[PDB]
Amino acid sequence: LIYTAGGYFRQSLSYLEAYNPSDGTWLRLADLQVPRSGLAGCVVGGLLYAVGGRNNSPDGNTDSSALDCYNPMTNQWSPCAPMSVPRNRIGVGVIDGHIYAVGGSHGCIHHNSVERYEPERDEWHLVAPMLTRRIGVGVAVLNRLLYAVGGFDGTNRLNSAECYYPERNEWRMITAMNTIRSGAGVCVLHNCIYAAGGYDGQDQLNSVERYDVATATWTFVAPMKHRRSALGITVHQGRIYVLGGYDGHTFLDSVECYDPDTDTWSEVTRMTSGRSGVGVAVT
């Protein structure tokens, strides 16, 4: 199932919900410990992790360095060791069962820093920083390489992307996307990095493009039906799902599904309520 964690609607949320794309059902599960929006989710060894974000509430706006683990057969959250710094609007990738925490903000500070989490040893350790300061960065894993895509450095919204080589611990800039995208949804489908939606400093976007490593080229595909940034994204059974986000006026509960063989999007459900900035993953 497609799990959605945290998010934001009037305040940061503790929601944990699961969508089943064959029966159209939604399942409510254990509330997050601390409310969170601007976080990212990943699944490592079946379990579900929530990384970074912040608690934007009527009484505070605390950037989070927390990492927390949800077990789908115990329905329980348990805290894991925190990161070195708070990471609001973070991006995460999983290479070889390790969690890479990328970018994000703490207050005014936009991080280029990156750190790796070891689930068998409950430790965080820094790795090499990015070339660029990125918040709202989209992360993907392709051929056990890590891609940081788009985002916001504090001044400019970014179409650039850079690649992290784990066995060399270095970052190389690559071909920039066609579109500037901060808070896009970024994932891997077929063997292309997909970049869906986002914000460019003027408008939310409904366009979608994908990166092919072999040719080092970005090419557009069918646009979503609804402009959105700060969306959740995941691929379930060779199809792309995008969840919620903000269209500049509304918090979307729209869930669109992209079929790569017809290059078609279509709305497959509504979340229980519109929200932005969730973390998403599948298990």
Binding site: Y8, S12, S37, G38, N56, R89, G136, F152, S182, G183, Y199, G201, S229, A230, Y246, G248, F251, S276, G277
Partner: peptide
């Protein structure tokens, strides 16, 4: 509001 995420500033 943040133009990108919608959150209150």
């Amino acid at each position: 509001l943040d133009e990108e995420t919608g959150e209150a500033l």
